[PDB]
A paper describes a structure:
The MTH1203 crystal structure was solved by molecular replacement at a resolution of 3.1 Å, using X-ray data collected at the zinc absorption peak. The MTH1203 protein has a tripartite architecture consisting of the two N-terminal KH domains (KHa and KHb), the central MBL domain and the C-terminal β-[name] domain. The two molecules found in the asymmetric unit are essentially identical and superpose with a root mean square deviation of 0.65 Å. Two zinc ions are observed in the active site which is situated at the bottom of a cleft in the MBL domain. The two zinc atoms are coordinated in an octahedral geometry by the bound phosphate and the conserved residues His242, His244, Asp246, and His247 from motif 2, His329 (motif 3), Asp352 (motif 4), His579 (motif B), and His603 (motif C) located in the MBL domain, similar to the active site structures of CPSF-73 and TTHA0252. A phosphate group present in the active site is a good mimic for the phosphate group of a nucleotide ready to be hydrolysed. The N-terminal KH domain (KHa, residues 1–70) was not detected by sequence analysis because it lacks the signature GXXG motif. However, this domain lacks the GXXG motif that is essential for RNA binding (Lin et al., 1997; Siomi et al., 1994), and the conformation of its helix-turn-helix structure, crucial for RNA binding, is different suggesting that the KHa domain does not bind RNA. Interestingly, the RNA-binding site of KHb is distant to the active site of the MBL domain, being separated by ∼42 Å with no significant positively charged regions observed on the molecular surface between the two domains. Analysis of MTH1203 using PISA indicates that MTH1203 forms a stable dimer in solution. This assembly, with a protein-protein interface area of 933 Å2, involves a symmetrical interaction between the C terminus region of each monomer, a loop and a β strand from the MBL domain.
MTH1203, a β-[name] metallo-β-lactamase family nuclease from the archaeon [name], was identified as a putative nuclease that might contribute to RNA processing. The crystal structure of MTH1203 reveals that, in addition to the metallo-β-lactamase nuclease and the β-[name] domains, it contains two contiguous KH domains that are unique to MTH1203 and its orthologs. In vitro nuclease activity assays demonstrated that MTH1203 is a zinc-dependent nuclease. MTH1203 is also shown to be a dimer and, significantly, this dimerization enhances the nuclease activity.
Author numbering:
A (entry chain A): 3 to 636
B (entry chain B): 2 to 636
Write the structure that this text describes.
Amino acid sequence: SEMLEEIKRTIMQRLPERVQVAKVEFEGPEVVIYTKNPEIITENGNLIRDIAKDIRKRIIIRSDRSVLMDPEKAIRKIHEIVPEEAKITNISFDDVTCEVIIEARKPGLVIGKYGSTSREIVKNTGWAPKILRTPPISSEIIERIRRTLRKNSKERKKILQQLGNRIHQKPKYDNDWARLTAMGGFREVGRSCLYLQTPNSRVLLDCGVNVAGGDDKNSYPYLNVPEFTLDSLDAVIITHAHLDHSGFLPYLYHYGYDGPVYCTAPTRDLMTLLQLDHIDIAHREDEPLPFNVKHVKKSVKHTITLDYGEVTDIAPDIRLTLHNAGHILGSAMAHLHIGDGQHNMVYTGDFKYEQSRLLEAAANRFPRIETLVMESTYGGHEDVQPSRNRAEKELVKTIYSTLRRGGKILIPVFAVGRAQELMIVLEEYIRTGIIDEVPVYIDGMIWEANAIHTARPEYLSKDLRDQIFHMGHNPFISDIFHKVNGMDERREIVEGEPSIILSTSGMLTGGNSLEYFKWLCEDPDNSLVFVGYQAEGSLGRRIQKGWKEIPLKDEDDKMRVYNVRMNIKTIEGFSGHSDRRQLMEYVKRISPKPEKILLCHGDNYKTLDLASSIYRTYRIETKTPLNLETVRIQ
Amino acid sequence: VSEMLEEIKRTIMQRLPERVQVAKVEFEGPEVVIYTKNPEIITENGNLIRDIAKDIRKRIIIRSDRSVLMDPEKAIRKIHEIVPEEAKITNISFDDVTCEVIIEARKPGLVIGKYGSTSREIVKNTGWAPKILRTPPISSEIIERIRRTLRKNSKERKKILQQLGNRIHQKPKYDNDWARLTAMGGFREVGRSCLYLQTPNSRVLLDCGVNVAGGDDKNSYPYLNVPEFTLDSLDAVIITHAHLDHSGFLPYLYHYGYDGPVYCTAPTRDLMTLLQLDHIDIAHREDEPLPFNVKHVKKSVKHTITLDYGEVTDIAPDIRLTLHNAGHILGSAMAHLHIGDGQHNMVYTGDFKYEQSRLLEAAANRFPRIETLVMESTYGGHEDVQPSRNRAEKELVKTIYSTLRRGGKILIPVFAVGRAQELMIVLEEYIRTGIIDEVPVYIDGMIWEANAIHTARPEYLSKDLRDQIFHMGHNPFISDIFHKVNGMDERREIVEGEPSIILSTSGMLTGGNSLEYFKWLCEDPDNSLVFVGYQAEGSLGRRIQKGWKEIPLKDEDDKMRVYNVRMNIKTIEGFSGHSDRRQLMEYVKRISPKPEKILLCHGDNYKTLDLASSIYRTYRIETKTPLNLETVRIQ
Ligand SMILES: [K+]
Ligand SMILES: [K+]
Ligand SMILES: [Zn+2]
Ligand SMILES: [Zn+2]
Ligand SMILES: [Zn+2]
Ligand SMILES: [Zn+2]
Ligand SMILES: [Zn+2]
């Protein structure tokens, strides 16, 4: 409140009057300078950056509300100076960031050669143009998120006002120490949740849920831990959108959390999609779910989207940076700069240290690092996956076999994960004629997630991105695929001609895939293909492990015993997690060599296995904490 | 007040005869107290009482109701009637809380009377319960001061127990799915021993010490600023032994609003308060801040509950505590915590010597069900094997007779309680025999006052020594050999005087009287210094022990002055109150039930890891060596 004034005074004393400052706000992680002279934005903020580096802050310049053009009139002036050439799809406005969102067929000519066209836009309207390429298909989810954000301007500004007020304070105490407390997904794969404590700050790294249909004592993170109180909590960071890592977030907002959430733009989008489906599933089966739609909305309002590499002040003593995890669209690793920096840490979350058809390999270059916290899903020597090539041949073989038998191939997948990777490869192999021309069916859920993909292309692999937006080969539109919604429709699918099915609930735990499974499991011609990791507990793993006598609800709700006779095939070398050797290589090749390693998100016996392996082959101390244990970082 | 309580009361009384004229049943601390209107029932060995006690697994105490207790003044009159004078009484005290009359006499057997006849009659006549004691050879200023405090706060103390008892005997709120221990001090170090046990229902501190090695606050005090620690949720504090590195921070808690109990042995409590008070006096005599005062030490006493070795006591709805002899110091204990269903119990050792000393019995190794064991590791690491004390004794005499005939004094710096006691015994015997030249040995007032407490708590001393003082009258703490030193003028007269033996307060040279004698005798080659206890990192003792000779400190007129050491520095290994490398190892072998997990504390970093490395390699038991803010899960 008072230390902030000194920050404001420093700005004004370093700035010319010509820059007509209206007010200086502390909005969230950043400092905002509002000017009554829009042309100032246009000029080089080099003097601005000189100030930013001087006070060690991020500084944004925007136009004051007074010098902003009425959106009505603002649109005319746009069409005036483009004009039709770069055919414009849509124009939107953002009352908070003072940006005009412009999506067009050819974004280049919205900008102008030396960025001169957009220069004219700001100079004439006062709006910062966000030049964006037209999405080949709109994503209902994003449209909704935008409506939420739009209609809640006033409220969002105050949240940012207050959040920023907490963030740029001088720390209350010295930074003697730092600690990490496990709260989930340790010596298990499930409720990934990690709790960082400073004498000043309390942050939660991931906040997930165990999807496996079991006890509450096994499905949720340990909030009942003495150290964790909700009021003390300064921020939640969400690596990627999988419910393993994000599913418990809406519970927090139900229990009265009032703070920020940080993640990549895709993460926020996918997250919302997955959580919303999680409501539809419970409403479908008549199961008491705690969080309503409202709690997802609150989550969205308090979410702060971050680009990869974008350094962010989230607490008086904590800078956050997100680096590409390359596991799922928008998946990220958290690098945390703590205090004086001498003891920084990195959390991986789920990651893959290999370029996929969809994503760029996980990052491995960072600022100074003391401690590394990595997943160990496929840890333990026995977990070397086969080469991408071999993995691909294997699939083709299975499908051809089924197709020749005249059957269908069911591949159960999460709405986002292996699904997209699978779609790229299948599209290609069919179109090329490596696989026989056969319809590939896809759950609305996956489809809707794909929409998000094409809409955040910057988060895809360069290779793929350029293939879509420069070469015009977009696999997700292909006539090969057919969108699926309604059990009514699905009935026809299973009764129809030999085909390939992608359906929701990655491990066969409820959802659509289960219903397909019911219909197809009793025919030896059909085959079930496993691609993702099958967690312990899940029916998927039970099936995989060889279980062939499964009891389920009937056409009505009658319990019926199902004698599985269909082919069960697991295809290794496709998972979103880096394999055993890749994990070990990731440690060999790091930015600064870490001095301590923690292992999480890993099956009990695989975690211990990797730990000794790492140490004996690299002589680096690795801790393998149990679920309620705490490790010191500083 | 509570329904769970009333239920117990009914079950108690429906199993009692009309003859037990029961006034009321109270829950007072860990125990259930039956007040009776018929004192003659106290007399009978409550065979039915103990039966009820085992059946409900609670501890039951019988007392006379305040109704049938005779006036204190009137009671005294009735007592002197029945001795009548032969067994010469020294002092008579009363305790409103326990309904107990305390009597110290020259001949206690005559106050009991054959067949307990006399004592029985005192109950019949006054309603008071006679606690009979022999009058100690020396009275303890500190023990008397405590007793006064307890008398003049009985009103409050009665209420304190009533609430505490009310909290303890409740049904556990949540299941006992998990248990965990947070290191808060004295881990990978020796300094602020403090340990935080937490269940879903209960929060207990094991030890609460101060790193006497006075430096930064961030290094001297335990880490209470850990998120998981609240003072409002803390159910109990357990103090193993009176040493400041285990007990010195306790008064801070009460300063900062702690309202709960402290558990320990009677001598521990007494010794505690002595060292705690001395620590306060030292700071104020040396113009230095300390975040607690006398006021707070008094509060600490008010809330203290003393226990005997092997006394099972309900601490929390899901915790039972038993203290076992640690053999380290007078009253030194290990803690056995029976948690929940008892499947995942733990033991904390504190400091301990797994060997019989002249002064104390060997550290207990026999316990009921255990899963986790937390032991000290001061002398971990293969290098830290100590030679037999028979050798240490011989090697000590050698040094003495050398320095003594050279025209020099022998300085031994010791904490008021510790090696001082042991040393005095072995010293007394050797001069009396004539193995040592007869020279006067000077003691600091502090060690003397500590001794007083030793002779007042006989039952905690080794069986041998207990027998030799209280049945043979060979009390070594009386020998004309020793001289109590108070004031500064006496100390100067020893330095200029003719050579002899010195014992001075503050073990490793922190300050106090210990630093005074040093700044008088170190520049003389004739003199020498002997280390007998452990030397912690942040001390001058540790520096002088490792070969360092030059130091900067203050003079008479508080002047920054140089001090050059020419004297002999001889360390006598094989006398510390900590069991050495061989004994620590042996302890793990002979431990009653084999633990399935071991945590190491109170050890030097490199030694801790060394030991742990060897524990696992030898016995293949998981050993954790947690850093100072880490948490280990027990269940
Ligand atoms: K809590
Ligand atoms: K605290
Ligand atoms: Zn995961
Ligand atoms: Zn994931
Ligand atoms: Zn490109
Ligand atoms: Zn000790
Ligand atoms: Zn100690």
